[PDB]
């Protein structure tokens, strides 16, 4: 299936911590992905014969910025794609990918941002997770902080990853405190807060926009992993998460037959539905990705090996693994990304290299 068709290296020689294909490409335009590393974001276009065409970068004013993460959305009025980036400065930048202008930025975390994710039905709802232990939900249409997910019952150390479920009714987050926490955003309070955030125009009122303080997860566990949890993804109602213990665990809150929407905050059980082991991934901040349909899952390890799991099987534990190696690919792979149509997989590395694999 996948064959390695090209690679390159970016000129800064620092880790590429993130990669994302733009899944909002217009019909008939070439496939495009963004990489983030050092103080820059760079866009590339995929062409035939494995060509990876360099386009243009956004380079931060601060030489000490270090971007960690990026996420694509689009402008909800014009349809044009937008790219959000963030990293150690704790500043979210919204980038026009065509000109690479910083259209606007958001501050509040003040503290490093480890991940950004956009809501799967509302292109304006951006979630950030921070070294300051909180998540924040932003509305990038009205430029409002809708809610802060924190408090002593929230995360007690850096939050490293988070994912919305299929309809963006709830969020699972995870971090350095070894726990995975659920935060429901379809509550009456949260739905109202979002609606109010769309009604907010500071030119038409005197009040500041009030943010929700959400201090209580809807479920919490520390029973899945025994070290920093660095990546989490919903799979329907189940969860896929990993730590730096050479495993992705597939699990769910509660007991085997418990409905996710009936789980109470005080739920003390989880169910393990399978575990996908692999090797040489004991460093933290190593993220897996899935294709658009959630048929497959790719993870790179710290010596440049790729694992891909076929999840198109009746139960999670029946996943079929294949691996992808190249003799010149030896640096740690921080993240992978599939093109929308699943024909291309990209891996980015700690030595600033980019690896292209075609189906």
């Amino acid at each position: 299936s996948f064959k390695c068709v090209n690679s390159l290296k970016e000129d800064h020689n620092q880790p590429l911590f993130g990669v994302q294909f733009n899944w909002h490409s217009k019909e008939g335009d070439p496939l495009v992905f963004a990489t983030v590393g050092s103080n820059r974001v760079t866009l590339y276009e995929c062409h035939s014969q494995g060509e990876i065409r360099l386009l243009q970068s956004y380079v931060d004013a601060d030489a000490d910025e270090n971007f960690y993460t990026c996420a694509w959305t689009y402008d909800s009025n014009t349809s044009h794609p937008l790219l959000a980036v963030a990293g150690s400065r704790g500043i979210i930048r919204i980038i026009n990918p065509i000109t690479m202008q910083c259209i606007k930025h958001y501050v509040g975390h003040g503290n490093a941002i480890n991940e950004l994710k956009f809501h799967p039905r509302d292109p304006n709802l951006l979630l950030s997770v921070s070294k300051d232990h909180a998540l924040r939900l932003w509305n990038i249409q009205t430029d409002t902080l809708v809610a802060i997910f924190g408090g002593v019952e929230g995360h007690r150390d850096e939050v490293l990853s988070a994912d919305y479920d299929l309809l963006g009714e709830k969020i699972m987050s995870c971090g350095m405190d070894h726990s995975l926490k659920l935060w429901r955003i379809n509550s009456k309070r949260m739905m109202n807060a979002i609606k109010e955030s769309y009604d907010y125009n500071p030119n038409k009122t005197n009040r500041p926009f009030i943010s929700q303080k959400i201090h209580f997860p809807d479920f919490s566990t520390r029973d899945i992993h025994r070290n920093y949890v660095d990546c989490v993804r919903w799979l329907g109602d189940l969860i896929l998460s990993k730590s730096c213990e050479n495993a992705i665990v597939c699990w769910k809150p509660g007991k085997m037959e418990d409905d996710i929407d009936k789980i109470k905050p005080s739920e003390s059980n989880v169910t393990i539905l399978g575990r996908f082991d692999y090797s040489q991934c004991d460093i933290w901040y190593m993220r897996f990705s899935m294709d658009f349909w959630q048929k497959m899952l790719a993870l790179g390890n710290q010596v440049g090996k790729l694992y891909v799991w076929d999840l198109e099987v009746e139960d999670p534990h029946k996943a079929k693994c294949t691996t992808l190696t190249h003799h010149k690919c030896g640096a740690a792979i921080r993240q992978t990304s599939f093109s929308r149509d699943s024909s291309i997989l990209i891996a980015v590395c700690d030595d600033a290299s980019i690896w292209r694999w075609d189906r």
Binding site: P15, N227, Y228, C244, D282, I283, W284, Y285, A332, D350
Partner: peptide, 5 residues
Amino acid sequence: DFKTD
């Protein structure tokens, strides 16, 4: 736990 090798 190391972020890097």
